[PDB]
Design a protein around this motif. Structure first.
Motif, PDB file in Angstrom:
ATOM      1  N   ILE A   1      32.295   4.700  27.579  1.00 21.67           N
ATOM      2  CA  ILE A   1      31.396   3.509  27.652  1.00 21.67           C
ATOM      3  C   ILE A   1      32.199   2.251  27.324  1.00 21.67           C
ATOM      4  CG2 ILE A   1      29.520   2.361  26.377  1.00 21.67           C
ATOM      5  CD1 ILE A   1      28.568   4.160  28.668  1.00 21.67           C
ATOM      6  N   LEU A   2      32.039   1.227  28.171  1.00 18.71           N
ATOM      7  CA  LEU A   2      32.587  -0.097  27.931  1.00 18.71           C
ATOM      8  C   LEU A   2      31.434  -1.085  27.784  1.00 18.71           C
ATOM      9  CD1 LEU A   2      35.493  -0.056  30.552  1.00 18.71           C
ATOM     10  CD2 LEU A   2      35.562   0.553  28.130  1.00 18.71           C
ATOM     11  N   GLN A   3      31.318  -1.695  26.600  1.00 16.35           N
ATOM     12  CA  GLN A   3      30.320  -2.730  26.382  1.00 16.35           C
ATOM     13  C   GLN A   3      30.769  -3.994  27.107  1.00 16.35           C
ATOM     14  OE1 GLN A   3      29.696  -2.465  21.915  1.00 16.35           O
ATOM     15  NE2 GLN A   3      27.599  -2.839  22.603  1.00 16.35           N
ATOM     16  N   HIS A   4      29.805  -4.706  27.700  1.00 20.62           N
ATOM     17  CA  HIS A   4      30.052  -6.031  28.239  1.00 20.62           C
ATOM     18  C   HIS A   4      29.156  -7.044  27.533  1.00 20.62           C
ATOM     19  CE1 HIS A   4      33.242  -6.090  31.114  1.00 20.62           C
ATOM     20  NE2 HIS A   4      32.739  -5.107  31.827  1.00 20.62           N
ATOM     21  N   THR A   8      25.353  -5.346  29.345  1.00 21.27           N
ATOM     22  CA  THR A   8      25.419  -4.114  30.114  1.00 21.27           C
ATOM     23  C   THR A   8      26.555  -3.246  29.582  1.00 21.27           C
ATOM     24  OG1 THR A   8      26.884  -4.978  31.827  1.00 21.27           O
ATOM     25  CG2 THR A   8      24.522  -5.276  32.192  1.00 21.27           C
ATOM     26  N   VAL A   9      26.498  -1.960  29.937  1.00 26.74           N
ATOM     27  CA  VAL A   9      27.596  -1.044  29.701  1.00 26.74           C
ATOM     28  C   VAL A   9      28.061  -0.519  31.057  1.00 26.74           C
ATOM     29  CG1 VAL A   9      26.717  -0.441  27.399  1.00 26.74           C
ATOM     30  CG2 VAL A   9      26.138   1.014  29.344  1.00 26.74           C
ATOM     31  N   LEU A  10      29.373  -0.297  31.171  1.00 25.13           N
ATOM     32  CA  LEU A  10      29.963   0.324  32.343  1.00 25.13           C
ATOM     33  C   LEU A  10      30.360   1.749  31.973  1.00 25.13           C
ATOM     34  CD1 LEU A  10      32.194  -2.550  33.790  1.00 25.13           C
ATOM     35  CD2 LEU A  10      29.963  -1.789  34.589  1.00 25.13           C
ATOM     36  N   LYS A  11      29.746   2.732  32.639  1.00 21.92           N
ATOM     37  CA  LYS A  11      30.139   4.116  32.443  1.00 21.92           C
ATOM     38  C   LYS A  11      30.970   4.572  33.638  1.00 21.92           C
ATOM     39  CE  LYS A  11      28.657   8.877  31.651  1.00 21.92           C
ATOM     40  NZ  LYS A  11      27.532   9.845  31.670  1.00 21.92           N
ATOM     41  N   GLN A  12      32.179   5.053  33.349  1.00 23.54           N
ATOM     42  CA  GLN A  12      33.071   5.540  34.384  1.00 23.54           C
ATOM     43  C   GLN A  12      32.558   6.898  34.856  1.00 23.54           C
ATOM     44  OE1 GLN A  12      37.274   6.603  33.464  1.00 23.54           O
ATOM     45  NE2 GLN A  12      37.750   4.858  34.784  1.00 23.54           N
ATOM     46  N   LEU A  46      14.719   5.285  30.973  1.00 25.47           N
ATOM     47  CA  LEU A  46      16.148   5.249  31.253  1.00 25.47           C
ATOM     48  C   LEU A  46      16.681   3.858  30.935  1.00 25.47           C
ATOM     49  CD1 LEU A  46      16.616   7.228  34.575  1.00 25.47           C
ATOM     50  CD2 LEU A  46      15.846   7.969  32.319  1.00 25.47           C
ATOM     51  N   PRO A  47      18.017   3.686  30.814  1.00 27.81           N
ATOM     52  CA  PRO A  47      18.608   2.355  30.858  1.00 27.81           C
ATOM     53  C   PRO A  47      18.324   1.780  32.243  1.00 27.81           C
ATOM     54  CG  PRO A  47      20.245   4.018  30.179  1.00 27.81           C
ATOM     55  CD  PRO A  47      19.031   4.743  30.721  1.00 27.81           C
ATOM     56  N   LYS A  48      18.077   0.468  32.317  1.00 30.39           N
ATOM     57  CA  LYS A  48      17.975  -0.189  33.606  1.00 30.39           C
ATOM     58  C   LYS A  48      19.301   0.024  34.337  1.00 30.39           C
ATOM     59  CE  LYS A  48      14.693  -3.688  31.898  1.00 30.39           C
ATOM     60  NZ  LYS A  48      14.393  -5.135  31.801  1.00 30.39           N
ATOM     61  N   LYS A  65      26.708   0.719  36.296  1.00 31.36           N
ATOM     62  CA  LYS A  65      26.354  -0.461  35.529  1.00 31.36           C
ATOM     63  C   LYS A  65      24.956  -0.242  34.967  1.00 31.36           C
ATOM     64  CE  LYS A  65      26.226  -5.552  35.896  1.00 31.36           C
ATOM     65  NZ  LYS A  65      27.310  -5.760  34.906  1.00 31.36           N
ATOM     66  N   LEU A  66      24.874  -0.181  33.627  1.00 28.64           N
ATOM     67  CA  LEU A  66      23.664   0.193  32.911  1.00 28.64           C
ATOM     68  C   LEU A  66      23.357  -0.846  31.837  1.00 28.64           C
ATOM     69  CD1 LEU A  66      24.591   3.966  32.495  1.00 28.64           C
ATOM     70  CD2 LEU A  66      22.993   2.974  34.138  1.00 28.64           C
ATOM     71  N   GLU A  67      22.059  -1.060  31.595  1.00 29.47           N
ATOM     72  CA  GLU A  67      21.574  -1.831  30.464  1.00 29.47           C
ATOM     73  C   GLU A  67      22.237  -1.352  29.174  1.00 29.47           C
ATOM     74  OE1 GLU A  67      17.429  -1.189  29.936  1.00 29.47           O
ATOM     75  OE2 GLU A  67      17.308  -2.339  28.069  1.00 29.47           O
ATOM     76  N   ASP A  68      22.727  -2.299  28.362  1.00 33.63           N
ATOM     77  CA  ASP A  68      23.157  -1.998  27.007  1.00 33.63           C
ATOM     78  C   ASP A  68      21.926  -2.075  26.112  1.00 33.63           C
ATOM     79  OD1 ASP A  68      24.230  -1.691  24.479  1.00 33.63           O
ATOM     80  OD2 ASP A  68      25.878  -3.120  24.763  1.00 33.63           O
ATOM     81  N   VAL A  69      21.481  -0.896  25.667  1.00 29.57           N
ATOM     82  CA  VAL A  69      20.263  -0.727  24.895  1.00 29.57           C
ATOM     83  C   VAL A  69      20.462  -1.279  23.483  1.00 29.57           C
ATOM     84  CG1 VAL A  69      18.710   1.077  23.964  1.00 29.57           C
ATOM     85  CG2 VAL A  69      19.533   1.238  26.308  1.00 29.57           C
ATOM     86  N   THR A  70      21.722  -1.488  23.073  1.00 29.12           N
ATOM     87  CA  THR A  70      22.038  -1.881  21.708  1.00 29.12           C
ATOM     88  C   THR A  70      22.251  -3.391  21.603  1.00 29.12           C
ATOM     89  OG1 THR A  70      24.445  -1.725  21.809  1.00 29.12           O
ATOM     90  CG2 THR A  70      23.246   0.338  21.452  1.00 29.12           C
ATOM     91  N   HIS A  71      22.089  -4.110  22.722  1.00 30.60           N
ATOM     92  CA  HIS A  71      22.512  -5.497  22.823  1.00 30.60           C
ATOM     93  C   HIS A  71      21.652  -6.408  21.947  1.00 30.60           C
ATOM     94  CE1 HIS A  71      24.325  -9.059  24.486  1.00 30.60           C
ATOM     95  NE2 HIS A  71      23.151  -9.493  24.896  1.00 30.60           N
ATOM     96  N   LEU A 189      19.263  12.079  24.450  1.00 28.21           N
ATOM     97  CA  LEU A 189      18.513  10.920  24.003  1.00 28.21           C
ATOM     98  C   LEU A 189      19.445  10.028  23.196  1.00 28.21           C
ATOM     99  CD1 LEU A 189      15.110  12.492  22.907  1.00 28.21           C
ATOM    100  CD2 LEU A 189      15.687  11.325  25.047  1.00 28.21           C
ATOM    101  N   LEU A 190      19.397   8.729  23.499  1.00 30.04           N
ATOM    102  CA  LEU A 190      20.067   7.724  22.698  1.00 30.04           C
ATOM    103  C   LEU A 190      19.029   7.045  21.807  1.00 30.04           C
ATOM    104  CD1 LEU A 190      22.877   6.350  22.382  1.00 30.04           C
ATOM    105  CD2 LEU A 190      22.004   4.579  23.917  1.00 30.04           C
ATOM    106  N   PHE A 191      19.234   7.161  20.493  1.00 31.71           N
ATOM    107  CA  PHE A 191      18.412   6.496  19.490  1.00 31.71           C
ATOM    108  C   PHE A 191      19.138   5.257  18.978  1.00 31.71           C
ATOM    109  CE2 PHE A 191      15.090   9.644  18.778  1.00 31.71           C
ATOM    110  CZ  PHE A 191      15.650  10.780  19.314  1.00 31.71           C
ATOM    111  N   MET A 205      16.676   8.014  27.538  1.00 36.46           N
ATOM    112  CA  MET A 205      17.339   9.174  28.139  1.00 36.46           C
ATOM    113  C   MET A 205      18.672   8.734  28.806  1.00 36.46           C
ATOM    114  SD  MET A 205      13.942  10.827  29.894  1.00 36.46           S
ATOM    115  CE  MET A 205      14.809  12.118  30.813  1.00 36.46           C
ATOM    116  N   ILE A 206      19.740   9.493  28.572  1.00 34.29           N
ATOM    117  CA  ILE A 206      21.033   9.225  29.192  1.00 34.29           C
ATOM    118  C   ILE A 206      21.717  10.537  29.586  1.00 34.29           C
ATOM    119  CG2 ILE A 206      21.329   7.026  28.001  1.00 34.29           C
ATOM    120  CD1 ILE A 206      23.398   8.509  26.165  1.00 34.29           C
ATOM    121  N   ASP A 207      22.774  10.424  30.408  1.00 34.99           N
ATOM    122  CA  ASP A 207      23.722  11.490  30.721  1.00 34.99           C
ATOM    123  C   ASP A 207      23.109  12.493  31.704  1.00 34.99           C
ATOM    124  OD1 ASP A 207      25.959  13.085  30.915  1.00 34.99           O
ATOM    125  OD2 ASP A 207      26.246  13.316  28.741  1.00 34.99           O
ATOM    126  N   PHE A 208      23.288  12.219  33.001  1.00 37.23           N
ATOM    127  CA  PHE A 208      22.559  12.918  34.051  1.00 37.23           C
ATOM    128  C   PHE A 208      23.500  13.627  35.028  1.00 37.23           C
ATOM    129  CE2 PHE A 208      19.869   9.235  32.767  1.00 37.23           C
ATOM    130  CZ  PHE A 208      18.918   9.969  32.092  1.00 37.23           C
TER     131      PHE A 208
END
Ligand SMILES: Cc1cc(C)cc(-c2onc3ccc([C@H]4C[C@@H]4C(=O)O)cc23)c1
Length: 238
Positions: A1-4, A8-12, A46-48, A65-71, A189-191, A205-208
């Motif tokens: 995960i790369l925070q922006h 958003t986060v970028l997951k490779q 889900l993350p947007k 490209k996913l919503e950063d839920v922690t932002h 699940l990401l809490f 919910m993450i990781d599909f």
């Protein structure tokens, strides 16, 4: 995960077939012309999803490209929990089933596994972190205390964050009890709660990489959600 900084986060994308499968999942769920009530409801949890992204000078390098839920949090406390009785999918070889069951041979009994946590401690103004070995070391005897740790800020147990987590998980559970078109293996699940506050929590919910079409209830996922809720409920009695 790369925070922006744009929230958003970028997951490779992981190696084939996992990365491609995850890209396909997000594409199905967030299809612009999707009118499936089940999948429209699923988007809430889900993350947007902002589509596939790759660096301007590197079309080969694929990310989600996913919503950063922690932002939106000041001092985010973060825990990733794998859900289900099986972390292996319906197309796993005997070798792969063995690998997956061994990584954490307790998956079937408990129905969830803590992948890690990051917990802000107020009185030290600092973070403690646990890695994958932490959750993989938890047993039936120690799972309650193991999960409790996430909600301990180093002076009180954050029962507000615990109760909020239950209420958000309950909604995901209600989604799973109302669908029979997807089964999820090795998903999480990401809490996220605010460490700095009262009862403000994200549960997504993450990781599909191992989501499959199905004709049945995802009974393994449900078992895990319910056990996790039961554990969180008992923490409220502390
Ligand atoms: C652990 C951690 C730390 C930090 C800092 C952020 C996140 C984080 O926040 N929002 C997120 C949205 C989606 C994902 C998923 C892509 C990740 C996956 O599928 O494994 C991770 C996310 C997670």
């Amino acid at each position: 995960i790369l925070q922006h900084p744009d929230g958003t986060v970028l997951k490779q994308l992981q190696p084939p077939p996992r990365g491609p499968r995850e890209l396909e999942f997000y594409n199905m769920v967030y299809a612009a012309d999707c009118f499936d009530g089940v999948l429209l409801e699923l988007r809430k949890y889900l993350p947007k999803y902002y589509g596939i992204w790759s660096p301007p000078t590197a079309p080969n390098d694929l990310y989600l490209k996913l919503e950063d839920v922690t932002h939106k949090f000041n001092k985010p406390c973060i825990m990733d929990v794998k859900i289900g009785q099986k972390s292996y999918d319906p197309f796993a070889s005997s070798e792969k089933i063995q690998q997956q069951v061994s990584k954490y041979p307790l998956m079937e009994e408990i129905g969830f596994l803590v992948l890690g946590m990051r917990v802000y401690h107020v009185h030290s103004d600092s973070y403690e972190t646990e890695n994958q070995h932490y959750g993989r070391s938890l047993t039936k005897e120690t799972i309650k205390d193991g999960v409790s740790r996430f909600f301990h800020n180093g002076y009180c147990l954050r029962k507000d964050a615990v109760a909020a987590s239950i209420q958000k998980i309950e909604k995901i559970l209600q989604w799973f009890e109302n669908q029979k078109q997807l089964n999820f293996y090795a998903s999480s699940l990401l809490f996220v709660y605010e460490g700095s506050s009262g009862g403000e929590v994200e549960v997504r919910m993450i990781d599909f990489a191992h989501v499959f079409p199905s004709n049945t209830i995802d009974e393994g996922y449900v078992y895990g959600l319910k056990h996790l809720i039961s554990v969180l409920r008992s923490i409220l009695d502390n």
